[PDB]
């Protein structure tokens, strides 16, 4: 009763503060510069060998090897330069919707409908890749996972909850519980001190890893947020949602700055990624092709057409050399 | 060959990996995947037991055919976000308890009816065949003798006999199949002490396979 009224008053206060902070629009400031003329990226490489829909890919920190997860229970490590398979890890459960590459490169992680995050050691004294840890504490499907370091990993699940684990012991040291809908994405900050997570309740929550509690909440979408990504600066992020819309939220301003959408697109967004400088926002839509937007002007700079099904995953190298797009047609494509 | 010895050996390793991947993916193409669905009291623990957290996978064999059943009832999350993982599937085995026409959790039979309506007309299963099982037929036979079916369907207007009532329930469930020109519904009445459902699933899957490779051959 009274608590609900207090919560409504607090929400109104937050909205009023955000409106007061809205001095201007980023579009007005960015209208004074020349946009990118026309981005034209051709398929430099085509990686084949997956025999099912590809659901997640992740580049290595050296940005030459990349891990890819598919529904045939396969985790393939590709040498992007020469197009050869370094490793092919068979998964215990073929229902996987996420995969991660350790920043050091010694480990990979995967998870899905088994509610478990499995860690595989790439560099063993033997010649194989073996599973080291099975983090099983979530009550819903695992939507994303990101290595903090060689021994810390944060995983978001469909039980409206994120967790930060200790891979040495396998026990989730921290639990982040503030979401009302299933969490579908994660994005570590460049300094890896805090992260963002978008949920099915059209809300993106920024959490602090060290304290363990939610720091900020952003609400500008209308449907589920399927993808989130952090700006290279670290003071902004982008969310792709099911209403065919991307939104650029800020941290210090605590409000959305730009809305990337078009009347010609009515299909959801499965993945987002940024260029190295952050000028290009790459979003993998459901219309079988990715779109490259000018992140400062909200202009569709280009289209990465060339996939025969939905683009599920999409990543950018650490040096910004290439863009990898996976898709439901079982083919990965490196563009430049 | 403009390659080093190490690079050539790496290419050879990649070729061996390719061969293993092709063999694995050709082994998985000869297996039949069935998605099992139902309600809490609909009854699918008996069906799994007869033809034999996270989702459960059951493997069995029948007449040189390997079947995988995906029991996903434990995933108490948004079904819209993980149902497309089963888009390419041979058939959907939908279990419904026909003895709960008067039970209340909101009638249980009505809950099963809306769940069937949602699953059958799903965008990911616009052509996937459905094997409908109606479980606990002895309990329904005992219940219909005393309590009329009109509890669930006020507009029944039919004889209060097991055969007519069961036929009416089956017709009511099959009428939810919107656009019945691309998909089939293989309704079946089962019981706890009845071992014939494996053959029924095998026949339905055989028809599905015939249709699938007729599409593959381009005859359709």
């Amino acid at each position: 009763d009274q608590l609900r009224q207090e919560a409504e008053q607090l929400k109104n206060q937050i909205r009023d503060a955000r409106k007061a902070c809205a001095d201007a629009t980023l579009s007005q400031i960015t209208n004074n510069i020349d946009p990118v003329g026309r981005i034209q990226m051709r398929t430099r490489r085509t990686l084949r060998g997956h025999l099912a829909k590809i659901y997640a890919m992740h580049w290595g920190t050296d940005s030459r090897l990349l891990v890819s997860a598919s529904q045939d229970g396969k985790l393939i490590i590709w040498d992007s330069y020469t197009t050869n398979k370094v490793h092919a890890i068979p998964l215990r459960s073929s229902w996987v919707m996420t995969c991660a590459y350790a920043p050091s490169g010694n480990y990979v992680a995967c998870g899905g409908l088994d509610n478990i995050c499995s860690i595989y050691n790439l560099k063993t004294r033997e010649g194989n890749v073996r599973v080291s840890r099975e983090l099983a504490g979530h009550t819903g499907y695992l939507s994303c996972c990101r290595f903090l370091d060689d021994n810390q990993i944060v995983t978001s699940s469909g039980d409206t909850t994120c967790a930060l684990w200790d891979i040495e012991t396998g026990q989730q040291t921290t639990t982040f519980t503030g979401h009302t809908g299933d969490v579908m994405s994660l994005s570590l900050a460049p300094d890896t001190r805090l992260f963002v997570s978008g949920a099915c309740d059209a809300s993106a929550k920024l959490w602090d890893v060290r304290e363990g509690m939610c720091r900020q909440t952003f609400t500008g979408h209308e449907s589920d947020i399927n993808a989130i990504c952090f700006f290279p600066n670290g003071n902004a992020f982008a969310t792709g949602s099911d209403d065919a819309t991307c939104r650029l939220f800020d941290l210090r301003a605590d409000q959305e700055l730009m809305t990337y959408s078009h009347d010609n697109i009515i299909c959801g967004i499965t993945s987002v990624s940024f260029s190295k400088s952050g000028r290009l926002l790459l979003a993998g839509y459901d219309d079988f092709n990715c779109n490259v937007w000018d992140a400062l002007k909200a202009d569709r700079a280009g289209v990465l057409a060339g996939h025969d099904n939905r683009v599920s995953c999409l990543g950018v190298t650490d040096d910004g050399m290439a863009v990898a797009t996976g898709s439901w047609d079982s083919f990965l494509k490196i563009w430049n | 060959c403009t390659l080093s010895a190490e690079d050539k050996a790496a290419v050879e390793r990649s070729k061996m990996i390719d061969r293993n991947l092709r063999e694995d993916g050709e082994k998985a193409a000869r297996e039949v995947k069935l998605l099992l669905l139902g309600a809490g009291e609909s009854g699918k623990s008996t069906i799994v037991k007869q033809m034999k957290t996270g989702i459960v996978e059951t493997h069995f064999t029948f007449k040189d055919l390997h079947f995988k059943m995906f029991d996903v009832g434990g995933q108490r999350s948004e079904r819209k976000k993980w149902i497309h993982c089963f888009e390419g599937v041979t058939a959907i085995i939908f279990c419904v308890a026909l003895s709960d026409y008067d039970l209340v959790l909101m009638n249980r039979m009505h809950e099963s009816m809306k769940l069937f309506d949602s699953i059958c007309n799903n965008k990911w299963f616009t052509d996937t065949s459905i094997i409908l099982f109606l479980n606990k037929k002895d309990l329904f036979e005992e219940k219909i003798k005393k309590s009329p079916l009109t509890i669930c369907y006020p507009e029944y207007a039919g004889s209060n006999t097991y055969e007519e009532a069961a036929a009416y329930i089956q017709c009511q469930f099959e009428d939810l199949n919107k656009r019945k020109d691309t998909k089939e519904i293989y309704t079946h009445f089962t019981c706890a002490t009845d071992t014939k459902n494996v053959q029924f699933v095998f026949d339905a899957v055989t028809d599905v396979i015939i249709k699938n490779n007729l599409k593959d051959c381009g005859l359709f």
Partner: single-chain antibody, 232 residues
Framework: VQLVESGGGLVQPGGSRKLSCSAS????????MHWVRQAPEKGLEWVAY????????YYADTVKGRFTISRDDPKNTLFLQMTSLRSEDTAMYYC??????????????WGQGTTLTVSSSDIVMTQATSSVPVTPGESVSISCRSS???????????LYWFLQRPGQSPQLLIY???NLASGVPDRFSGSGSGTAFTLTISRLEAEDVGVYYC?????????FGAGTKLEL
């Protein structure tokens, strides 16, 4: 991981013998394997190579057409059949594992060695230094020269450094110049520029005293280099 060799012994010249190495402790089927021989008083010399799945088999021109290498993957064993044993075939044979992918470390583990005594275009690798007198705690640089440039188009410089302690099989320190192996102390460092290479030890204990060999993996037949003994 271990590789135990068997065979050897005293063989009359013109005879034949089969060397068998049993591998136990690693995924044998995913490793290419090599036979490398060392004369009773001379340095190392490569002999044979068989890939993963036996899809590629190479021999040295000193033994090509006379030796036959093979592998039993299900039984986890490597075989070398030697026919028409000359008097120059007496040596100690080491079976070596090497796996080739991006970032791999070939020649990482060496076998114990089996002895074999018989009764009575190549890239030349030069180790001019020999019997270098050294003292613990100092810094020692070992030089090496190559007849052909080991640097490749992709950017790799296929120069490998091996340390053989007295009475022990050689062990890998650097598997490509400036790439330190696993389990090797950080003091060892490798550098090179074209056809001239240098292995540096900033501080040395009494353990790292022995013969230092250089190998090239640019092209077959994988020519080694002469020894560089270090004296305490």
């Amino acid at each position: 991981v271990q590789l135990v060799e068997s065979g050897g012994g005293l063989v009359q010249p013109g005879g034949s013998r089969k060397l068998s190495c049993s591998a136990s402790g690693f995924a044998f089927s995913s490793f290419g394997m090599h036979w490398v021989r060392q004369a009773p008083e001379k340095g190392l010399e490569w002999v044979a190579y068989i890939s993963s799945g036996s899809g590629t088999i190479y021999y040295a021109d000193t033994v090509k057409g006379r030796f036959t290498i093979s592998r039993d993957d299900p039984k986890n064993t490597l075989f070398l059949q030697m026919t028409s044993l000359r008097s120059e075939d007496t040596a100690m044979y080491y079976c070596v594992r090497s796996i080739y992918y991006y970032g791999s470390s070939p020649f990482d583990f060496w076998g114990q060695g089996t002895t074999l005594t018989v009764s009575s275009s190549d890239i030349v690798m030069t180790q001019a230094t020999s019997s270098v007198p050294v003292t613990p705690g100092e810094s020692v640089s070992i030089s090496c020269r190559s007849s052909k440039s080991l640097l490749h188009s992709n950017g790799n410089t296929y120069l490998y450094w091996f340390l053989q302690r007295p009475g022990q099989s050689p062990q890998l320190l650097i598997y490509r110049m400036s790439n330190l192996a696993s389990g090797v102390p950080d003091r060892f460092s490798g550098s090179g520029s074209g056809t001239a290479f240098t292995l540096t030890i900033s501080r040395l204990e009494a353990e790292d005293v022995g013969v230092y060999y250089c190998m090239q993996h640019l092209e077959y037949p994988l020519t080694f280099g002469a020894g560089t003994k270090l004296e305490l």
